[PDB]
Design a protein around this ligand. Structure first.
Ligand SMILES: Nc1ncnc2c1ncn2[C@@H]1O[C@H](COP(=O)(O)OP(=O)(O)OP(=O)(O)O)[C@@H](O)[C@H]1O
Ligand SMILES: Nc1ncnc2c1ncn2[C@@H]1O[C@H](COP(=O)(O)OP(=O)(O)O)[C@@H](O)[C@H]1O
Ligand SMILES: Nc1ncnc2c1ncn2[C@@H]1O[C@H](COP(=O)(O)OP(=O)(O)O)[C@@H](O)[C@H]1O
Lengths: 745, 484, 131
């Protein structure tokens, strides 16, 4: 059927562009600048301009939200397309905004919005069309009230533009193009797609499930930190798909008086049924359904039982799905986790640097940022924040930029001017200031991500690199030969050797290479669960580790419990035994299917109990040799990436003086040399400003800041007052134990 | 409860009838755990109502629960609930049967290995399998949305006749799946046969005489006044057919098997201290005549005063509870107890008492031909070493354990797999780098163990077993030598 | 609860207005300390009332307390109380300005060393100096 195409998202931000596959448009005689009339349901029609796309399939058409609402259509709909190249330039067109746009606006919309928006645009417009123009920091709506020639006309340099008239009242059949949508979410692409398909299947073809007879999911749970747009996601999905989203708030429920409270729920369930297929969102489940031991009275238990009965009794009838939201999937009472109940659980993680960047990009779209933005820098330096944090930061930056403009806006007037507003911009100083009066909310929490450590950042250990490749990339990339042989890949690899050799660096590098999530666990928190809190945390940690599959769980200072095993106290035998039991039971219980690998690191292989050392457990062992010669040079190169330059002395020469030194020692040497260089720069600047100020306000010749010019002097001084912290006794002990374990096995 | 009363008043007046109670533990928890007052009234009303309906009556009561102990124990007198039926998770045979039941109407394509799926989906339930079938059907329909009448109203139920599923859809569904059992005891007959183990024929005969013999001829046992001892201990080097032995003997006896290891025992050491072996032994006792296995039994003996200087807590508690519970085993049920240890010298003689665990068995190292048979058992696999079938190298493996042989075989297999990977990668990037000059794909000789693998394996030869441990084992055996 | 509701609706009729509430910990402690049920209803009602204050009018609400630890964390989300300001104990100098303020009417004789008193009065507060 080369007349109907299914609509999907668009990659072009223009309001009159459609993206198609090249062969399909060639068959239908569609090319660049070709005006096409599109007609669909509601007897609505539009005119658009054909554009090309590679990723767009023949049956699909990329087209944005504006004409979606103009055509009164949603995603996946079929449309009638006809090449109609009979358009004529408009002559006199009366266009008006909507009533809810000029509130305290005034000014001239024409020269600021209509004049630039319609310059060389040649948008094919139709009578009754509505469109949006991005203001200085707002969004302005505009609907044509009359056109000439009607209804087909291209905006032309020769037009009689009538912007006069009251902003027309909002149409009440469809609200507006202002509410949320799929285009307003950042940092949750995978889970967004999952939820999108799992709800698109039932909500678009209920009769399909009626005939087929399968049971659609009856409850979906979302868990994550507060203020991450979970409610935003639910509302946007409901609005885009087309439903009767009916939010219920937990806090207002128990604010009522006993039975009436749950009656409300019943009423909600009632309006769930006789309102066509629709979606129900419930918030703060823990506030209404805490753990059993948390409950103390009888009203709470009655409420929980009432909710359970109401939701369990719902067996199909109206195609109603339940969306639940919570902070952490542990505070909820377990009974509401069974089959026929909330079973499909989705995490909402903290956005990464890229997620923060894209969210900030979304939030700053309406405003008029100055031409100096470094959004990547802000995104990477604002780690530990959520979407609400970024929105607040943008709002504060805009507000401060406004505040440092009072001279232009000295009391202004009760009806502000639009030209003045659009004449302003926000600079990077405003962003830095907003950062100064800013505070993240994540703070103390676990972080999951794929790091950026590369192989070249570490010199040497090429055999170790090859072994890591063999033990990581091989099982995942071609399990076919593994199953043809039947050999079960191992999961337990441990590293031992001198400290500060970047073994964690190797773990991060291999995680980056495998492009899988990385999770680190450090000895401090291990001891933190050793006392005080029990082992229970470890449990969900593994669950979290199992949640982020594929992922590489990392352990650092695994001998800390071993260090507490034998040390200056030696009194925590029971807690250490509990730790060992919990970790062993979690690690051996994982399914071999999961692409989850465990890495252990230590520098005291002599104290680790061989109970962990066993087939089916951490069994693979790797010694990390100390840096040597060219390796140090490579390290000397790696830490020299940095920024400054010291092209005065051979690095290999310094490696020759620093033979038998730890890599961390080399990094310390480089750091000390750079500290000396910073001191030299500081003292030179101080001397030059002092000599410029002792001379009265003397600006004769500015002494440019010297290029990094480190000599042999600073390097020699650093080498003098810094030595190899590792002594040869440690090396001999490591090597003798290595040989003992080598020939004892 | 009026409605409950209503139910009862309509239950008898409606001919013979059956009454089911859903989630009983939600109604009758333990008395102390109750906090309000209405729940106690409800529980008492229920008890009175169900006890008072004795008369003649024709109504039977059904009550379902997850944790039998979680309910209030008072409602277990005669006339009240007295007969308990456990519904455990199914097995691979049961899983396959249930899958057939759910897919009896499926017009599936003839490309699915239901047996492989059933073996793959261990630790699941019937609901899990039903959900898997539903999602597999959904995936199959989704993969072919375009041609079906999505544009029109729903299909007239004839295009769907052309629809079919694939095993790939099943694998994909299994990818987006989550089992629910996970942490749960398993009760079943193992599948390890005597072919899986080599050597120790005398040990096998002794085990047979201990376990099998009493059941067939108990008449002479009672004639001579013989009650076989329920208990045995194993000591020897680690990783030398210890769990394998128990699995094989349980399989031959065709009885259920239950295992628990030292990590679990030390888990019950603190935290959930004690009060756990009781329900485990009760579960075994109510279960069919089966076998109980105690691995790393010495762990508590290793932990009571071994190397840390503990607080003197569960060290006695767990052992005393175990001894008290096993002393309560008054024959009747034919369940056997087996313990395994690697440092028996630390075990206190309290357990080593007649009536308690008394039989002692030392496990020696394999002996060449025994080592050869063990290697052959481990070398089922797939590749075959034709020229050199691991004979002279097997000769020089004196003093190694079966675990060592398995490790060597696994290392050889994985290195051969690595060789195959690198050879195939070489072939492919040579083929693409060259402008498609060659495209032939002949199978490499990898699936046959080659001698070069044998040298490269024996270069990294592992002397895992230490002769000091062997001498300690033999001197302790002579310390408890039956021959005076 | 009605009274609280009453307060809020009055602000709706009374332009941008300031709503000040005192001793929140006395009425909004952590749920661990909450033993009865009525307090839970009160907290839920106030949370619902204040969270529904989106747009409405230009009404600003602030609260007085002693320790944020004693406050229930649920009243820490975005849109709720997020701005945090602490009032530290004044130094000797601040004591000096406080004394100057409070002694405006007094006819001090030519022997008063306010600085000396401020130095000697470490560990006091404004109420202390006023008394
Ligand atoms: N991924 C996101 N993209 C854009 N804005 C986001 C995102 N996540 C959060 N926000 C912003 O945070 C606010 C959402 O607040 P909201 O009350 O909906 O929070 P929530 O995370 O859905 O749930 P809860 O309020 O229960 O914590 C809005 O200002 C929204 O712009
Ligand atoms: N290319 C490199 N090779 C070896 N060591 C390095 C390299 N780059 C940095 N290092 C050092 O390694 C340290 C990190 O080592 P780490 O894995 O933390 O060992 P440990 O955990 O024993 O301290 C860093 O402090 C750094 O000084
Ligand atoms: N036929 C056999 N003879 C001896 N050992 C075997 C045989 N088959 C397998 N094994 C090894 O015996 C081990 C049994 O483990 P087990 O002896 O219980 O360990 P541990 O003694 O440390 O508890 C298995 O890991 C397996 O590698």
């Amino acid at each position: 059927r080369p007349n109907r195409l299914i609509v999907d998202e668009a990659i072009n931000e223009d309001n009159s562009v459609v993206s198609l596959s090249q062969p399909k448009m060639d068959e239908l005689q569609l090319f660049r600048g070709d005006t096409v009339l599109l007609k669909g349901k509601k007897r609505r029609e539009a005119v658009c301009i054909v554009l090309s796309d590679d990723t767009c399939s023949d049956e699909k058409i990329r087209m944005n939200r504006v004409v979606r609402n103009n055509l009164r259509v949603r995603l996946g709909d079929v449309i009638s397309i006809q090449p109609c190249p009979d358009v004529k330039y408009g002559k006199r067109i009366h266009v008006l905004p909507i009533d809810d746009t000029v509130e305290g606006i005034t000014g001239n919309l024409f020269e600021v919005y209509l004049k630039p928006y319609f310059l060389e645009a040649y948008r094919p417009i139709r009578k009754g069309d509505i469109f949006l123009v991005r203001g200085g920091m707002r969004a302005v709506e505009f609907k044509v009230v009359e056109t000439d020639p009607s209804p087909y006309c291209i905006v032309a340099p020769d037009t009689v533009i009538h912007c006069e008239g009251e902003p027309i009242k909002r149409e009440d059949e469809e609200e507006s193009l202002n509410e949320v949508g799929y285009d307003d979410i950042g940092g949750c692409r995978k889970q967004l797609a999952q939820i999108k398909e799992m709800v698109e299947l039932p909500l678009r073809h209920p009769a399909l499930f009626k005939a087929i007879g399968v049971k659609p999911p009856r409850g979906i749970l979302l868990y994550g930190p507060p203020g991450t747009g979970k409610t935003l996601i639910a509302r946007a999905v409901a609005n885009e798909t087309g439903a009767f989203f009916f939010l219920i708030n937990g806090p207002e429920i128990m604010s009522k008086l006993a039975g009436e409270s749950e009656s409300n729920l019943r009423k909600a369930f009632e309006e769930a049924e006789k309102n066509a297929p629709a979606i129900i969102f419930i918030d703060e489940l823990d506030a209404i359904a805490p753990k059993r031991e948390k409950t103390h009275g009888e009203v709470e238990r009655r409420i929980v039982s009432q909710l359970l009965t109401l939701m369990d009794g719902l067996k199909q009838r109206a195609h109603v799905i339940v969306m639940a939201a919570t902070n952490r999937p542990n505070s909820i009472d377990p009974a509401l986790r069974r089959f026929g109940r909330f079973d499909r659980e989705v995490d909402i993680g903290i956005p990464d640097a890229t997620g923060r960047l894209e969210i900030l990009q979304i939030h700053t779209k309406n405003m008029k940022l100055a031409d100096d933005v470094d959004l990547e820098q802000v995104a990477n330096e604002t780690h530990g924040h959520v979407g609400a944090d970024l929105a607040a930061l943008c709002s504060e930056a805009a507000l401060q930029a406004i505040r440092k403009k009072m001279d232009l806006i000295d009391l202004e007037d009760e009806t502000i001017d639009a030209e003045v507003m659009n004449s302003l911009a926000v600079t990077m100083d405003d962003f830095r200031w907003a950062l100064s009066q800013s505070n993240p909310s994540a703070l103390r929490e676990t972080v999951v991500e794929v790091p950026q450590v590369t192989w070249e950042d570490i010199g040497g250990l090429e055999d170790v690199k090859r072994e890591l490749q063999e033990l990581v990339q091989y099982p995942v990339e071609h399990p076919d030969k593994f199953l043809k042989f039947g050999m079960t890949p191992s999961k337990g690899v441990l590293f031992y050797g001198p400290p500060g050799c970047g073994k964690t660096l190797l773990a991060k590098a291999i995680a980056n290479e495998c492009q899988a999530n990385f999770i680190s666990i450090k000895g401090p928190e291990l001891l933190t669960m050793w006392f005080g809190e029990s082992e229970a945390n470890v449990r969900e940690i593994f669950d979290k580790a199992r949640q982020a599959a594929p992922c590489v769980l990392f352990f650092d200072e695994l001998d800390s419990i071993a260090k507490a095993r034998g040390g200056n106290i030696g009194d925590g035998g029971g807690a250490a035994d509990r730790v060992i039991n919990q970790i062993l039971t979690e690690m051996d219980g994982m399914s071999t299917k999961k692409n989850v690998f465990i890495i252990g690191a230590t520098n005291r292989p002599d104290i680790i109990d061989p109970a962990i050392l066993r087939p089916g457990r951490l069994d693979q062992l790797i010694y990390i040799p100390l840096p040597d010669e060219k390796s140090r040079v490579a390290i000397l190169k790696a830490n020299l990436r940095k920024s400054p330059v010291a092209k005065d002395v051979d690095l290999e020469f310094l490696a020759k003086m620093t033979n038998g030194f730890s890599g961390a020692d080399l990094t310390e040497i480089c750091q000390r040399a750079c500290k000396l260089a910073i001191r030299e720069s500081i003292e030179s600047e101080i001397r030059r400003e002092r000599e410029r100020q002792t001379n009265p306000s003397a600006m004769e010749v500015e002494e440019d800041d010297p290029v990094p010019e480190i000599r042999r002097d600073h390097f020699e001084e650093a080498m003098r007052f810094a030595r190899r912290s590792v002594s040869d006794n440690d090396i001999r002990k490591y090597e003798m134990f290595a040989q003992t374990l080598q020939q004892s096995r």
